[PDB]
Amino acid sequence: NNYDGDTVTFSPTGRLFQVEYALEAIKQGSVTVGLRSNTHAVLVALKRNADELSSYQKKIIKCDEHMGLSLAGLAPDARVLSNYLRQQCNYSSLVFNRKLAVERAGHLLCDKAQKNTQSYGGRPYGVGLLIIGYDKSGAHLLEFQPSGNVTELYGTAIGARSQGAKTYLERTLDTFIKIDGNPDELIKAGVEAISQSLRDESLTVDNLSIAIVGKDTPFTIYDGEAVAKYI
Amino acid sequence: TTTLAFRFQGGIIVAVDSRATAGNWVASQTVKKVIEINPFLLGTMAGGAADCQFWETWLGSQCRLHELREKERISVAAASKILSNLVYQYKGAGLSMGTMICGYTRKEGPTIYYVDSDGTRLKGDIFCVGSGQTFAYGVLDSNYKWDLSVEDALYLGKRSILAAAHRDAYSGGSVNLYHVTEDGWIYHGNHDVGELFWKVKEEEGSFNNVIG
Amino acid sequence: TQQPIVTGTSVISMKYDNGVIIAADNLGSYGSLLRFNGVERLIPVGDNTVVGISGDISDMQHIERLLKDLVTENAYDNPLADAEEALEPSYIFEYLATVMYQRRSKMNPLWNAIIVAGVQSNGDQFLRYVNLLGVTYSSPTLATGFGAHMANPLLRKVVDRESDIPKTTVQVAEEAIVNAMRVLYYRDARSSRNFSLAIIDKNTGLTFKKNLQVENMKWDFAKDIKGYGT
Amino acid sequence: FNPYGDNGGTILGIAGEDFAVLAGDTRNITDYSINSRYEPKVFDCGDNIVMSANGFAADGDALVKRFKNSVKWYHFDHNDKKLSINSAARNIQHLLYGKRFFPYYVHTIIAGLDEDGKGAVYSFDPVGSYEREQCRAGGAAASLIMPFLDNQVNFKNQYEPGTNGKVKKPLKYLSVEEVIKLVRDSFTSATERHIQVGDGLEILIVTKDGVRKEFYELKRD
Amino acid sequence: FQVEYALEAVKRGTCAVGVKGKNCVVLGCERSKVSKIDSHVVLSFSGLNADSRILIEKARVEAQSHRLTLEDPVTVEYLTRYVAGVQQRYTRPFGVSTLIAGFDPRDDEPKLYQTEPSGIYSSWSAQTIGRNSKTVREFLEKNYDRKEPPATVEECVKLTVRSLLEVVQTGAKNIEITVVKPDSDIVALSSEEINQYVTQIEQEKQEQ
Amino acid sequence: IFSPDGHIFQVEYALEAVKRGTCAVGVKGKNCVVLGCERRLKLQDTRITPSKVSKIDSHVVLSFSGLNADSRILIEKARVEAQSHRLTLEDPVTVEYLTRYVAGVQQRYTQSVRPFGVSTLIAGFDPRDDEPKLYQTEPSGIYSSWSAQTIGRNSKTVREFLEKNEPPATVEECVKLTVRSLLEVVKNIEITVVKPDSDIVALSSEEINQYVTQIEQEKQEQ
Amino acid sequence: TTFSPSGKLGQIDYALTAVKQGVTSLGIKATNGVVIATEKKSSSPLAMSETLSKVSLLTPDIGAVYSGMGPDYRVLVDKSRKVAHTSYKRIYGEYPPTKLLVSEVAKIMQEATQSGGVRPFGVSLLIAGHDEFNGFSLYQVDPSGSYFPWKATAIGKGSVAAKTFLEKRWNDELELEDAIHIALLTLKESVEGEFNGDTIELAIIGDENPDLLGYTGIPTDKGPRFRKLTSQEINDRLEAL
Amino acid sequence: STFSPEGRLFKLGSTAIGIATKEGVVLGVEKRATSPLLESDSIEKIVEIDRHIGCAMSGLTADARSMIEHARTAAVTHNLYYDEDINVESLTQSVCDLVALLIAGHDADDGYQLFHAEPSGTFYRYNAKAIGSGSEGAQAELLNEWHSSLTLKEAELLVLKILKQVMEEKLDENNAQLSCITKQDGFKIYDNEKTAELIKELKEKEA
Amino acid sequence: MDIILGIRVQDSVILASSKAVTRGISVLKDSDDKTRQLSPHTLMSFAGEAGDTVQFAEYIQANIQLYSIREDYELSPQAVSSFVRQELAKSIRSRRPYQVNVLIGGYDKKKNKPELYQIDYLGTKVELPYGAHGYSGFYTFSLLDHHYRPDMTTEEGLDLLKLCVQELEKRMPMDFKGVIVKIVDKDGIRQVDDF
């Protein structure tokens, strides 16, 4: 239709087609799962390889010891958004010695992403991010979308076929939020959830990437040999 | 500081002291006063340590970009011109530099370009730079010959730096020698003045006024 | 600002076993003219922080406005701002120090010396000094202006090292502070009889005793002095 | 408006086989007044490096903050890899010379183990100009401290007895403990003869086992 | 298709030919397009001469600026790279292809290059640009030999004029020749010289 | 932007606008250069209406065809440059140099906005030489020397006449050839005589009438 | 504003059409003066037509009238005054001659004809003025920036009929009052509605008017040569007509 | 600058091939000189980015050359600011932060790497890769032949065999070109003599 | 400090400049050529501050060569001198003035006359028969006034230059290490081995 090609045009029904197609951009990407307990937050990602001879894309970006994120959709937009988040957290640390609260980071990314959806010439970010962190208020998990919407969550999954993972997370919500004093079972529940989104493929030491942050855990990414114990 | 570089039949001999001073306090006696731009190009820093070190390290990166783009080494004239233009554009800003750009190129032969804070750039066969330059000249001009042997040229540079180290308060430390050959530069080592002086007095019999 | 016109003289502070005590006189002097006597130079920024400022009074009011804006902007989109993720003394001091150093670097300095005193959420006392040049330091006792020379020895006699803080109770520290005010009033020509005192305690919060008087002055020995020499 | 000051501190870096030592007093000064007895100015910088920016305190804080930012960005980009001592030296050189015409009036020292596992000490002037040194004092009492360290650590002007000044005393390695003893005695002398030193001595030791901090009392008068 | 249309514009410019000998490089053009950029290097173009002016002036300014920034004059490689870089930057774009030829400072090896609206440049021993470049290039391929190169200025000028006369109507009034020689010994052949060589080749073309 | 097949739309349409403009004629002599224009209305003020031939400097003049509005911009650009050249160098501009500058200013507007719909003939003498000069320019930004040339709406006809009509010898033959080109293509003609030493003069209506009556007598003779 | 395939500037012709839709305006040169005339329409009987003057002073020696879009004329006029002062009088200490100011106004309107994001001005001007060197002048300036001097001319919806009438009436020996008479007759013949001193307005570039100079005691200064004829002055002539 | 309803944003060149091994990385390019007059030595389809990084390209179009200059500036400024050669993945990220590309090089962090930019600009590390019109046929052979114990000697003949299989003209030291990067030698280009003897080794294998 | 002299002869312009280069307490070089060939028949000699002299000389030479390349003819010595003056005068009010005095000696191949222009660091151009800059004019001008003639041949001009240079050697305190003499005439530029 004639309203699709520009970000600054409402449809006759009031829809922003150019942003909903950015959402389709995440729907193109592979699944990444996130979940939290009161003390630990976990990310689980199914990486992709262009060819049998090719290595996999790193889908987890570490901000620092208390925060990090994963990707779904256009990786370069993830680079841009992640470096902006790094700039904001670094500025907070230099100017206040203050750990940038995860909700503050989420809303900063919301504000930055909203700008592209209102001014002409800009393109909506075709990437959605799951952000986890641990601060003075406990473990956090956020869902970021191109439209700018940012949502705090117990758990979620974004990417292709993530609906099954989200269904499993909704079913087991009352369980994994109770997990206390140990990260192992939380990561196990995360890998069980992500396994719901696999077709003609299975979790393997090369596909899977796991990350975690919490009270006793600075942000660490497990991959390769380290993730073998969870697959 | 004392630094000297003179062309001769075997290439170029570059000699420098090591002392660095801040007022009367001798800050250090092991300052490397030769910046190694590339295996065939050699900078000789004097005056302000920070300015020379930083800007000749940057000149190294410019040289690297030059080989990467044009597949041939930056000429001594070109590198000295870049440095001269840069130092000129900061004239009056407080740069303190005295630099001899010594190098060897197939289409230039052995070449020395003197560059300093005030923007000058001089091609020449013999140069002495630093607070002790006059004392080094007194020996070089009285002993220099084009057809000196490599050993004799090295000894002449060592002795010329030794004279300035003896007579100049700001020019002691140790003598570092470089020989810029047809196929590159050769670092002929470090000589401590506290031993070179006595060795030279014994062998030459000079410094007869010095007790010992 | 290149020169201070109206100034507040001195601020002193010390940390005791459970918190920090800080005091400052209410006089802003226009040169040698004791012009304004109602100035308040202790700036509460919460139940856990109070900021003492010296030097140019106009720059002090600017800094107070900056602190008010900090408090205002911290509460934006911060549902927890009133109990956690609230502004600690450390955050206030770090922001102030960054601003002061930046102003210094631009050759447009705030002619103030600032003591940020408070207690962190973990209960640890916070007490740091920052001046126009951006120079910062911490100590069991801090003072500004003539306090750094007159008052600071008196406070150090009470808490000379970090080991003495738990030994120092509220009453001992308050007596030391009041005696330092009396001495500064005696010997500082820019000082005033009226001063404000603020106590931040990890248990009982911020107490802010305003318009206190210097008392127990000793003058009766002056009747025996008979001029220079004879 | 004079934008500079002098907070009267001293730092000392010594390197040898198996270790590197960076020591500095905790006294903080303004004119003839003691600002604080314990303000650390030698910092454990992570990555098995120790840093100090002695001199004008505000510029020291600013430069240290800038270097922390730069090393953290290096970690962001280069996949959280360990930063080498020479890379840190070049980073600090570029930080310092970035303000050539409005310098940081701080004499910086970074100490650590180089890529070969041998101790390394890099020292900077306010403009840049880093030189790797076996030992390098700095600050107010540099002139008092350093000659004695030359004499003891390098045996300058010392000759084997009976050789009538022809054979120098060989430069055998000092162990870490012996370097601590030399540092303590040198700082005791600097305290005793220099008014700006004597509150407290803090020493950071760098070795493959990691950074190790030791604190010693000084006269404090 | 903007650069494609620019190339179509190139296809309507007058033809220019270059030949490299052992000690000479000679440029020929149908009826001076061959213009001197620096004392030792020249530039020839085919296409919109209106758009060629900006390229020529930028090249000249860059050559002098290089001589001012570095003591050494520009090499033919450097000038060709700059021409390509500028010609990219306007991608309306310039509808012109170019040849760059000459000698490097204190050099002895003649250089010849070609540059394209794409910004592509490559070294050539002999090359043509313009409307009938295909026929002239085919003619050159069967008359030039890498393993038997021209030896003298006479051979170079003869080969250039013979290549141009393949399609040119009347050489004396319809071609021009410039000879570039080491150490800025560049010269342009006058009417009597070019006519001498043209008649020399004419005496042979009529015989077969 | 280029057209497919290598054309350029706006330059072609500016050429059309030039082709629909009033004519400008030029003839260069052995010792002088003569430019002629047909003025091509009963209430229009003849006393003060500007002549199409314009001075760019003391020694060089410009004549134009096409959009009159753009001619003013082009002329002021040329004048400013001609004076700036004397600001930087003592010597005044050469005719070649001036035609080159006007070609450049015309070109720059085609690649940068619309092209100038103007074409021009440039005539003059070098500052201390004496050879005649005549040059032409068009919207594309290209120039060439000429012995006698014309631009405008009658060009397709009068151009072959001038080709039909060894340069002329003396100023009488130059003005005669110009006026005969204007009259042979079908007395309201501007004639400007450009001579070294900056003598630039426009022939009066009575001088034009003298030449025109002589040439009509010759035409009657056949 | 770009060339069409036929070589015409596309949107300029539309500006000319807008001018043709404007009310009639006139200009006539006498040997000793210049007259510019125009009828002023009204939006309603309640509107104070005396508030707006279609004729306006550019310099004390130069005046302008227009046909077309009035707001465009107003902004072009204050632009013209600004350029006449800043660009010429600020430098040379004298007001620009009619030729120079006409050239600057033509440049102002031509910039819109050769610049994107702006439409051409929808007004044609008749700029009457006087000079010590060029003498009296009358110029018509079109939306395209093309300007030509006229002995007498008319613009607006009555252009052709007024022009054909002026061609009959104008002669080389008109005095200023004869020019005013001819202008009154021509504009009366073109006004379809009521015709009196309040619907018509006149201005003249004639002899010096020291009575309007506003001060005395300087023999060198001469006073404005431009002056509008008041409603009573025009009524006097229409009654004598 | 606009997404399609499917979430995506709105091959004919010459072939380049590369192999990565525990011992080194080898790159190869079809030259395909368009005329015997063209200076074959002037066809630089492989260029150095840094003393341990080289880039093989389908064609050195000016858009590629600007990217080469940006990558070279990134490497040189990294050396200037950090006194260390740029890591391959960091260089690829910097270029991405700025045509089919095979960025390949060596470092002590990840050893020997080869990178190929997918059409969306996302670099993927590869064990073996081919680009250009020959990639469609090359990929199957690369999948067949690569093994973890592949030696550099075998990798050279592998790349040469791919070139022979896909090229339009019989291999010689002029119409095709090789380059490799090694920990000790750095990035280097095989001279015509070495290419020639490798071609004769290929022929001997065929014999 | 520098010596730069110029004498305009009936046929040629004779430019002489000192060979010494002094920096502080020491003479660095004793064979420096303080001249640049602006064009085949135009020669410029400069004196002044160390970096400024050569930087301005090369900037002017590059600009003159660019102009000659663009217009495909040699600029007249008048035009070259006017450009140099405009560059000098334009600089004194800028942030970085050029403390450079220049003598431009050229042969106008169109007028077929030698031309000598003296331009000071402020930008004061003046055409002279004989010119000198700085203190070098304080000794030579009286001798040149005494002995100069318009009709001299280049050899009498060289004899007069010898007189001037040896007068400078006699009375003037500095050791300028001799002069390097170049003749500008119909045939171009050449250097005299020992005038």
Do the beta carbons of residue I184 and residue I43 sit within 8 Å?
Answer: yes
Can you tell me whether residue D109 is helix, strand or coil?
strand
CB F75 within 8 A of CB F62: yes
β-bridge partners, B14: B5, B178
Q: Report the residue of chain E nearest B85, measured CA to CA.
A: E69
Distance between E11 CA and the closest CA of chain F, angstroms:
8
Of I16, I131, E2, I26, the C-alpha closest to F111 is: E2
Place of tokens 């191109």: A146
Q: Does D78 touch chain H (CB under 8 A)?
A: yes
- Of D151, D148, D191, whose CA–CA distance to D168 is shortest? D151
> D52, C93, C43: which is closest to A95 by C-alpha?
C93
Task: Please tell me which of the candidates H42, H62, H66 has its beta carbon nearest to residue E122.
Answer: H42
How is the beta sheet containing C205-213 ordered, strand by strand? Answer: C141-143, C11-16, C19-25, C194-201, C205-213
Give the C-alpha separation, A101 to A137, whole Å: 8
Residues 6+ apart with CB under 8 A from A40: A134, A139, A179, A183, A186, A212, A213, A214, A215, A217
Cα F22 from Cα F11, distance rounded (Å)? 19
Q: How far is CA H32 from CA E77, E145, F172, H194, in A?
A: 22, 19, 67, 19
Find chain D residues with C-beta within 8 A of H84's C-beta: 84, 86-87
Sheet holding D128-133, edge to edge: D42-44, D49-55, D106-113, D119-125, D128-133
The neighbour count for residue H76, using CB atoms within 10 Å, is 21
SS3 D17: coil
Helix and strand totals (H; E) in chain B? 5, 12
Which token pair is B186?
């050769």
How many whole angstroms separate alpha carbon E125 and alpha carbon E17? Answer: 11
Q: Name which of A217, A209, A141 is nearest A183 in CA terms.
A: A217
CB G131 within 8 A of CB G12: no
Q: CA-CA distance, I96 to H95, in Å (whole number)?
A: 39
Element at A170 (helix H, strand E): helix A162-176
How many degrees, rounded to 5, is the angle at CA G176 between CA G175 and CA G181?
Answer: 100
Number of domain units in chain G? 1
The tokens for I65 are 């060569």
Query: Which residue in E36, E60, E68 is closest to I58 by CB distance?
Result: E68
* Dist. CA G204–CA D127, nearest whole Å: 77
Minimal Cα distance from I60: which residue of E? E68
Structure tokens at G9: 């500037």
Q: A133 near A220, Cβ under 8 Å?
A: no
> What chain E residue is nearest to I62 in terms of C-alpha separation?
E64
Q: How many residues does the structure list for chain F? A: 222
Neighbours of F163 (CB within 10 A): 10
Resolution (A): 3.0
CATH superfamily of the F9-221 domain: Aminohydrolase, N-terminal nucleophile (Ntn) domain (3.60.20.10)
Q: Choose, out of B68, B69, B71, the residue to mutate when testing the contact with H (most H CBs < 10 Å).
A: B68
Q: Do residues A113 and A148 make contact, with C-beta atoms less than 8 angstroms apart? A: yes
Domain membership flag for residue G87: yes
E104 - beta bridge partners? none
CB B159 within 8 A of CB B196: no
Is there a contact between D61 and C134 if contact means CB atoms under 8 Å apart?
A: yes
E42 with E35: CB under 8 angstroms?
Answer: yes
Radius of gyration of chain E (CA): 17
- Give the separation between CA I190 and CA I188, rounded to whole angstroms: 7
Q: How far apart are CA H72 and CA H82, in angstroms?
A: 15
Instruction: Give how far B73 is from chain H: nearest CA, Å.
Output: 15
Identify residue F136 by its one-letter amino acid code: Q
Name where chain F breaks: residue before each gap, C-N > 2.5 Å: 40, 112, 165, 186
Report which of C141, F67, H169, H100 is spatially closest to residue G146, judged by C-alpha positions: F67
Distances (CA, A) of E126 to E23, E150, H100: 14, 11, 30
Which residues in chain C touch residue A137, judged by CB atoms under 8 angstroms apart?
A: 80, 84-85
With residues binned 3-state (H G I as helix, E B as strand, rest as coil), the percentages for chain I, rounded to 5, are: 35, 35, 30
Residue B114's closest chain I neighbor by CA?
Answer: I28
**Could you say which of H1, H7, H97 has the minimum Cβ distance to residue A21?**
H7
In degrees, to the nearest 5, what angle opens at C-alpha C164 toward C-alphas C163 and C167?
120
Asked if D91 and H82 come within 8 Å (Cβ–Cβ), the reply is: yes
Contact criterion met (CB < 8 Å) for D76 and A94: no
Domain of residue D202: give its range: 10-217
Q: Which residue has tokens 């100015």?
A: D41
Which structural technique was applied?
cryo-EM
B51 CB neighbours in chain D (<8 A) are 100, 127
Query: Does a structural domain hold residue D81?
Result: yes
- Helix G231-240 and helix G176-190: axis angle, to 10°? 90
Radius of gyration, CA atoms only, chain B: 17
Q: Which two tokens stand for residue F5?
A: 């097949």
AA letter at E165: L
Residue of F nearest to I76 (CA): F91
Q: Is residue A229 classed exposed, middle or buried when 0-12, 13-18 and 19+ CB atoms within 10 A define those classes?
A: exposed
> What CATH number labels H16-206?
3.60.20.10
Instruction: Please give the single-letter amino acid code of residue F188.
Output: N
Axis-axis angle for helices E153-164, E191-205 (nearest 10): 70
Which of B211, B9, B10, B12 lies closest to B127, judged by CA? B12
Give φ, ψ of I76 to 5 degrees: -65, 150
**B49 in a labelled binding site:** yes
- For residue D173, give how far its alpha carbon lies from the nearest alpha carbon of chain A (Å): 40
Phi/psi at A9 (nearest 5 deg)? -115, 120
Do E119 and H63 lie within an 8 Å CB cutoff?
Answer: yes
Q: Determine whether I132 is exposed, middle or buried from the number of CB atoms within 10 Å of its CB (0-12, 13-18, 19+).
A: buried
Scan for tokens 């002599």, then name that residue: F29
Shortest CB distance from H4 goes to which of A21, A74, A79?
A: A21
CB atoms within 10 A of CB D35: 23
Q: Give, rounded to a whole angstrom, the gap between the first and last alpha carbons of chain E.
A: 46
Q: Taking CA G80 as the corner, what is the angle to CA G77 and CA G86, rounded to the nearest 5 degrees?
A: 140
Q: Is E48:E55 a contact under the CB 8 Å cutoff?
A: no
Distances (CA, A) of F83 to B107, F125, I70: 46, 16, 19
Distance between CA atoms of residues E172 and E157, nearest Å: 14
Q: How far is C-alpha D81 from the chain's CA centre?
A: 25
Asked whether the beta carbons of residue H38 and residue E124 sit closer than 8 angstroms, the reply is: yes
* Residue B4 · residue B134 · CB < 8 Å: no
CATH of the domain at G89: 3.60.20.10
Q: How far is E149 from chain I (nearest CA, A)?
A: 32
Helices then strands, counting H and E runs in chain F, come out as 6, 10
F125 to B206, F24, F29, F130, F200: CA distances (angstroms): 80, 20, 12, 6, 11
Q: Which residues of H touch E127 (CB under 8 A)?
A: 37-38
Residue B121 forms contact with I (CB below 8 Å): yes
| Cα I98 from Cα I94, distance rounded (Å) | 9
Please enumerate in sequence order all residues whose Cβ is within 8 A of that of H107, keeping only pairs 6 or more positions apart, or say none. H52, H85, H87, H88, H113
Cβ <8 Å between B75 and E77 = no
Q: Does D76 touch chain A if contact means CB atoms closer than 8 Å?
A: yes
Cα distances (Å, whole numbers) of residue H202 to E188, H56, H139, H177: 51, 22, 20, 14
Phi and psi torsions of A3, nearest 5° = -100, 0
CA distances in angstroms from A5 to B43, B79, D96, H2, listed in the order given: 59, 53, 50, 6
Q: Is I23 on the interface with E (CB under 8 A)?
A: no
Listed as own residue / partner, the contacts of E35-39 with beta carbons closer than 8 Å and 24 or more positions apart are E36/E186, E36/I69, E36/I72, E37/E63, E37/E79, E37/E100, E37/I69, E38/E63, E38/E64, E38/E67, E38/E73, E38/E74, E38/E79, E38/E102, E38/I69, E39/E73, E39/E184, E39/E186
Under 8 Å between Cβ of G97 and G134 = yes
CB contact under 8 A, I79 and F90: yes
Q: H or E segment at F127? A: none
**Structure-block tokens of residue B179:** 């020989």
DSSP labels, C86-150: ---HHHHHHHHHHHHHHHHHTT----EEEEEEEE-TTS-EEEEEE-TT--EEE-SEEE-GGGGTT
Enumerate the β-bridge partners of residue B16: B3, B176
Domain positions in chain H are 16-206
Burial class for F207, CB neighbours closer than 10 Å (0-12, 13-18, 19+): middle
Q: Which residue of I has its CA nearest to E62?
A: I66
Virtual torsion, Cα C183, C185, C190, C192, nearest 10 deg: 150
Q: Please indicate whether, in this complex, the C-beta atoms of H72 and B58 are within 8 angstroms of each other.
A: no
| Domain map (residue ranges) of chain A | 1-231
Give A-chain residues touching H125 at CB under 8 angstroms. 54-55
DSSP string for residues in B170-211: TS-SEEEEEEEETTEEEEEEEEEHHHHHHHHHHHH---TTS-
Give the Cα separation of A197 and A190 in Å (integer).
12
E120 touches chain I (CB under 8 A): no
Q: How far apart are CA B198 and CA B194, in angstroms?
A: 7
List of chain E residues whose C-beta atoms are within 8 Å of the C-beta of residue B78: 70-72
| H or E element in which residue C176 lies | helix C170-187
- Is G1 within the bounds of a domain? no
Cα G107 from Cα F140, distance rounded (Å): 23
Q: In angstroms, what CA-CA distances link G64 with A26, F43, F136?
A: 65, 19, 38
Closest residue, chain B, to H77 (C-alpha): B61
Q: How far apart are CA H40 and CA H26, in angstroms?
A: 21
How far is A166 from A35, CA to CA, in rounded Å? 10
φ, ψ of residue I48 to 5 degrees: the values are 145, -155
Active-site residue flag, C1: yes
The CA-based dihedral angle spanning residues G121, G125, G129, G135, taken in that order and rounded to the nearest 10 degrees:
110
Question: Which residues of chain A does C90 touch, with a Cβ-Cβ cutoff of 8 Å?
Answer: 97-98
Chain F partners within 8 Å of E49 (Cβ): 142
Q: Is F79 helix (H, G, I), strand (E, B) or coil?
A: helix
* Ramachandran category for residue I185: left, alpha or beta (phi over 0 → left; psi -120 to 50 → alpha): beta
Tokens standing for residue E24: 């000479």
**Contact B70/E70, CB-based, under 8 Å?**
no
The sheet that has A155-158: what strands, in order across it? A155-158, A32-36, A40-46, A208-214, A220-223
What residues contact residue I113 under an 8 Å CB cut-off, 6+ apart?
I107
Q: Is there a contact between E8 and F8 if contact means CB atoms under 8 Å apart?
A: no
Length of chain D: 221
Q: Which two tokens stand for residue F59?
A: 């020694």
Could you say which architecture CATH assigns to the domain E1-206? 4-Layer Sandwich (3.60)
- Residue B173 neighbours by CB distance under 10 Å: 26
- Token output for H5: 């309803």
**Residues ≥6 apart with Cβ < 8 Å to B195:** none
CB contact under 8 A, E61 and I62: no
Q: Which of I101, I86, I83 is nearest to I1 (CA)?
A: I101
Distance CA E27, CA E127 (A): 10
Secondary structure (3-state) at G133: coil
H129 has which bridge partners? H18
Interface contact A54-H4, CB threshold 8 A: no
With CA atoms as reference, report the closest residue to B136 among B155, B154, B161. B161
Report DSSP state, residue I76.
P
Tokens matching residue A229: 């114990």
Q: Of I59, I63, I69, which is closest to E36 when you measure between CB atoms?
A: I69
Would you call H76 and B65 a contact, using CB atoms and an 8 Å cutoff? Answer: yes
Rounded to whole angstroms, how far apart are CA atoms E58 and E65?
10
- What 3 state SS string does chain H have? CCECCCCCECCCCCCEEEEECCCCEEEEEECCCCCCCECHHHCCCEEEEECCEEEEECCCCHHHHHHHHHHHHHHHHHHHHHCCCCCHHHHHHHHHCCCCEEEEEEECCCEEEEEEECCCCCEEEECEEEECCCHHHHHHHHHHHCCCCCCHHHHHHHHHHHHHHHCCCCCCCCCEEEEEEECCCEEEECCHHHHHHHHHHHHHHHC
G71 token code pair: 């707001």
By CB atoms closer than 10 A (0-12, 13-18, 19+), residue I109 is middle
CATH code at position D207 = 3.60.20.10
Q: Is residue B150 within 8 Å of residue B179, measured between CB atoms?
A: yes
Judging contacts by C-beta atoms under 8 Å, the chain A residues touching residue C88 are 98
- Give helix then strand counts, H and E, for chain I: 4, 12
Interchain CB distance below 8 Å, D125 and B28: no
Distance (Å, whole) CA F150 – CA F120 = 9
Contacts of D91 in chain H (CB under 8 A): 81-82
Residue A167 structure tokens: 């269904």
Q: How far is CA E139 from the centre of its chain?
A: 17
Q: Which two three-digit tokens encode residue B46? A: 């004097």
Subunits in contact with chain I (3 or more CB pairs closer than 8 Å): B, E, F
Q: Residue G39: give the domain boundaries.
A: 10-240
* Residues ≥6 apart with Cβ < 8 Å to F77: F101, F102, F105
Q: Does B96 touch chain E (CB under 8 A)?
A: no
- Residues of A in CB contact (< 8 Å) with C are 94-98, 101, 103-104, 107, 135-137
The residue of chain B with its CA nearest to that of D138 is: B27
Q: What distance in Å separates residue D52's CA from the closest CA in chain C? A: 16
CA–CA dist E123, E100 (Å, integer) = 9
